[PDB]
Amino acid sequence: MNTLRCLTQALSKSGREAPKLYQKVIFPGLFRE
Amino acid sequence: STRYALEHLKEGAPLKGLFSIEGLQKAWFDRVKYLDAKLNDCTNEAQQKPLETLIHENSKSASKKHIVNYASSLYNLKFSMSSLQGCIRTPPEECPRLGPEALLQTPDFNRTISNEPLTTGNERLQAALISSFGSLMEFRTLLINSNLAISGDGFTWLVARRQLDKRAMRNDMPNRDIEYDKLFILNTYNAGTPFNFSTSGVMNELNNQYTNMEKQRAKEAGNLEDSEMTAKQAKTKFIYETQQKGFSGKEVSYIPLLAIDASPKTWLTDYGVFGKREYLERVWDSIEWKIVESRLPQRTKIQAFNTL
């Protein structure tokens, strides 16, 4: 029951710090020729 | 001179705090008269064509280079002198001449500002300037420093970068033609032209032709290519292209928005030699920002104000 309180206060004291990620679609058929 | 007159300036009159009667004469009217005389003396039968069109159509040819010389000088002087209107300060004829202490005198661009466009109401221009150079103090200091640094006859320009859209040069596209990306400051010397789209690659093409002809000489003499012949030339070509590789589509061009003259002929008459700084400061105070805000083209709405 205390897990919710503890994680909420951890969120309060910890910054979000959204990261940067790089992704795009890839298909196996690119190298069939 | 009729084809190159302007409302602000008149014959036998001084400008407000900037030029005397003699100063204005010897700076603008004598120059324009001489330029017109020599330009018409040279082979310019198509005089009815605009100066910009003449420059663009005729270039990249030493045989027809004096035409470009004179036309570019005339256009440069025209644009540089157009923005001037006058200032509050005392006329030079009554203002005392400066001496050697001018050099030791310390500039105040780091602590002061004047003649802001926002006062005249060009918030668009103000936003562009702030986003480009950070602050009006940055902008003013850069302009004055660059123009005072340039020694020989030349000009300093406020250019706007225009990124050519991917096309095969299809004209007549209204409401999307003049779209700029960012504002920059450039220097031109003698007859330099701040457009860059009829200028980029000249030395690269000269080098390509030179290496081709050297290859013909080698083949007809029965010679063999060397390590440098195959590597140094390739590296020079690669660096040339990469340096002049602004964008895939016709690279990037520059739209003029303002120009300031650094030729000694413009300011030595009424400011001596020590007074170049004072002449530049009065020029700054004597800019009518309405002209530049009118000349400022739209921003690149595509993808930028789209933000998608």
Partner: protein, 101 residues
């Protein structure tokens, strides 16, 4: 990096690597996470395991350093997915042995 969920066809042909090696990494990377429904060659008795092991076995004839860490990472991912702790252990061991950090 984003990959495909699975395929319903035969293994793609192996391209040449002597002149153009950089496709080996991509090929193995996609294959490791590709699940084939046609030949069912991704299982313990399938051909995918032997196909990759015959290339990872001698480490090429002479061009041993042609490989990188991602190939081992993906191989361990594959063995993990197919529940081979022994296999993953051996890949980690030989990967560390080769000296790559």
């Amino acid at each position: 990096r984003k990959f495909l969920k699975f395929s319903n066809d035969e293994i793609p042909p192996l391209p040449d690597f002597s002149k153009n090696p950089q496709l080996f990494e991509n090929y193995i990377g996609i294959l490791s996470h590709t699940k084939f429904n046609f030949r069912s060659s991704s299982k313990l008795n399938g051909i995918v395991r032997k196909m990759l092991r015959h290339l990872l076995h001698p480490t090429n004839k002479t061009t041993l350093p042609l490989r990188s860490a991602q190939v081992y990472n993906d191989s361990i991912y594959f063995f993990s997915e197919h529940f081979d702790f022994a296999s993953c252990r051996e890949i980690f061991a030989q990967m560390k042995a080769e000296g790559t950090k």
